[PDB]
Amino acid sequence: MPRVKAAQAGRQSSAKRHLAEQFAVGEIITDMAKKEWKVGLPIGQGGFGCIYLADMNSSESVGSDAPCVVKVEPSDNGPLFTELKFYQRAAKPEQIQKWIRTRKLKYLGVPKYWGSGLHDKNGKSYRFMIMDRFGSDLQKIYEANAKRFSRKTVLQLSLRILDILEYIHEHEYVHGDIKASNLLLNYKNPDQVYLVDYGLAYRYCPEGVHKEYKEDPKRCHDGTIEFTSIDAHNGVAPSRRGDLEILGYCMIQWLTGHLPWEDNLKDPKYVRDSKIRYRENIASLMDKCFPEKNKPGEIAKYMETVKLLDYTEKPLYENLRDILLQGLKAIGSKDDGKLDLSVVENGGLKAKTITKKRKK
């Protein structure tokens, strides 16, 4: 006496053609700078979906086909508001190079900003923003490459993401979702990874002042538990320990190309039991996933160290970066020149809004 049942469906159509209602490639978008940016070919990546190139024609001496694009968002001012806020707030050549050079930072893994604008579609204000020229994605590359990256890449990315993660963590936002979906590359430059999709911004410390674990008791689940880690999965702000922990998980997953708990990440209970069970002796789990394929140590120690200090004691960029560079350079290899993710995939990344109170 079995029992089965199910169903599903879906569709969507649209079309138009007439004056003041038929936009297309080459269209001129007016920015807050009172200018006119021409839209180029479609992209779909580089912002929040449905992104179109920018600066098609030339105004004075072409600059490498004018590597620029413009993302378009719906009239809501929700996720784009926050993302754009910090995006433009932390965007600047002189500003960045200033603090970066003054603090000897390992470069900033953030996209370049130029300007923004909104076009009122009679009842629907379409907001858009111009940024660097992107095309590749870490979510797609890993999909076709089966997260089969070398140590050089894992280290390079980890380092970059770390620097940026700190510069922002010292403000009031942290990309709890380190998922590759937030990692994008240049339109055709593998030696340049930028972290976009700030929509997953999670206020680390309230009013700039940290607070004991007790933010979202109902699991803020800002993003996919897969990368959200126990921190975000528990609604608690990743006070250093969380950020680092997440980076470690994704790091080993990239070097291994497969995750044990991942296959069982379908549910939260599993992800939790896995995090704890693996936390008990991450060292054994790290060495277990790699008997003798390469050299599991940088990630093993890095993680063990991040949890060896405490749940929320204090960060250790120098210490972590030390063990990481030590194990990575221990093999006599480091800084091949740029990166090792030029597989050229180009897919369709994703995004989401910040967790707090608004999602209706």
Side-chain angles (χ1 to χ4, degrees):
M1 45 258 119
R3 309 176 111 169
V4 67
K5 254 125 85 74
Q8 253 219 254
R11 256 133 168 290
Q12 253 213 322
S13 42
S14 88
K16 259 126 164 211
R17 175 239 215 189
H18 246 121
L19 239 77
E21 209 197 22
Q22 191 49 34
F23 65 86
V25 64
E27 248 45 30
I28 273 57
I29 50 132
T30 351
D31 69 346
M32 294 293 151
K34 200 81 102 216
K35 228 133 265 152
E36 286 180 311
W37 311 130
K38 193 132 149 222
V39 55
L41 253 96
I43 313 179
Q45 300 83 50
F48 239 87
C50 313
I51 327 301
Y52 321 134
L53 237 99
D55 212 338
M56 274 259 122
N57 242 81
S58 21
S59 250
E60 239 126 60
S61 204
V62 68
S64 313
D65 218 50
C68 301
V69 306
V70 44
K71 63 250 246 219
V72 68
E73 258 62 76
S75 192
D76 255 65
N77 316 310
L80 188 81
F81 172 80
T82 300
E83 157 171 87
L84 172 63
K85 178 122 188 216
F86 217 95
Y87 166 40
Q88 178 272 313
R89 180 59 63 183
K92 250 145 201 193
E94 56 214 345
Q95 191 103 108
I96 292 168
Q97 289 273 6
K98 265 294 237 280
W99 113 58
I100 287 292
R101 291 252 181 165
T102 298
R103 292 238 288 287
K104 215 79 171 70
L105 255 286
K106 210 215 146 83
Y107 194 69
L108 203 71
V110 123
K112 208 195 134 59
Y113 177 61
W114 318 74
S116 309
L118 167 147
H119 192 53
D120 170 68
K121 196 153 208 257
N122 262 76
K124 275 233 73 142
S125 345
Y126 275 91
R127 242 218 183 164
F128 54 80
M129 281 126 49
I130 261 182
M131 40 179 258
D132 263 323
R133 230 206 223 177
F134 304 149
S136 258
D137 325 74
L138 216 84
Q139 170 269 343
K140 177 72 202 177
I141 286 145
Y142 110 85
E143 183 44 55
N145 208 353
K147 26 181 165 229
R148 293 236 282 194
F149 316 135
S150 293
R151 238 169 306 165
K152 55 188 74 132
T153 16
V154 187
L155 233 310
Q156 281 281 320
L157 266 303
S158 160
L159 289 171
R160 256 58 176 289
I161 298 301
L162 254 141
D163 291 278
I164 180 168
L165 177 145
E166 186 280 310
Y167 156 73
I168 65 191
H169 170 95
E170 229 236 55
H171 258 296
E172 233 148 288
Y173 124 76
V174 286
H175 47 267
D177 249 41
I178 197 107
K179 195 152 197 186
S181 160
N182 79 345
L183 265 106
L184 294 309
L185 326 181
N186 237 48
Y187 71 104
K188 213 214 231 263
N189 226 42
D191 62 291
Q192 244 144 59
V193 56
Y194 323 86
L195 202 79
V196 310
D197 312 316
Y198 272 45
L200 272 42
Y202 191 45
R203 52 233 307 289
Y204 155 45
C205 49
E207 291 187 12
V209 47
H210 71 300
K211 76 179 229 103
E212 237 62 25
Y213 63 101
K214 243 142 220 199
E215 170 42 57
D216 242 280
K218 212 75 200 175
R219 308 115 58 179
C220 81
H221 76 112
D222 87 274
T224 56
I225 192 171
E226 181 181 347
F227 283 105
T228 240
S229 270
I230 54 183
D231 276 82
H233 172 42
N234 274 228
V236 82
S239 194
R240 316 115 156 186
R241 163 58 185 278
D243 273 332
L244 308 162
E245 195 79 286
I246 302 140
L247 194 53
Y249 281 132
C250 75
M251 271 170 65
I252 177 174
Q253 172 241 24
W254 288 330
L255 175 64
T256 59
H258 231 63
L259 270 180
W261 75 76
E262 170 248 323
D263 276 330
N264 308 341
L265 87 90
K266 72 197 294 166
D267 258 49
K269 272 133 212 180
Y270 259 117
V271 180
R272 229 191 188 186
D273 290 358
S274 37
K275 293 257 153 51
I276 302 165
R277 185 152 256 185
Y278 281 55
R279 266 175 73 195
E280 273 149 20
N281 203 339
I282 70 290
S284 289
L285 278 295
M286 253 95 270
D287 298 322
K288 178 69 257 219
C289 203
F290 266 133
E292 62 151 321
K293 209 276 125 213
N294 27 43
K295 221 142 156 87
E298 315 119 34
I299 307 95
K301 275 269 80 148
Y302 169 94
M303 266 198 72
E304 176 170 288
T305 256
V306 137
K307 182 256 165 169
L308 169 59
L309 48 104
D310 248 313
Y311 89 110
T312 312
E313 165 137 291
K314 266 117 79 83
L316 282 163
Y317 304 92
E318 52 98 39
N319 217 297
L320 297 153
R321 171 181 303 171
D322 253 37
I323 173 264
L324 229 57
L325 263 121
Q326 174 61 91
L328 182 276
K329 179 181 84 80
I331 55 150
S333 323
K334 45 147 274 241
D335 319 329
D336 186 65
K338 27 267 240 99
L339 281 185
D340 209 307
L341 215 110
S342 318
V343 73
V344 188
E345 234 59 79
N346 161 225
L349 69 131
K350 311 217 142 240
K352 226 203 222 201
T353 181
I354 71 181
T355 190
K356 252 247 275 98
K357 241 194 192 295
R358 193 159 169 175
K359 243 195 190 202
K360 54 179 205 85

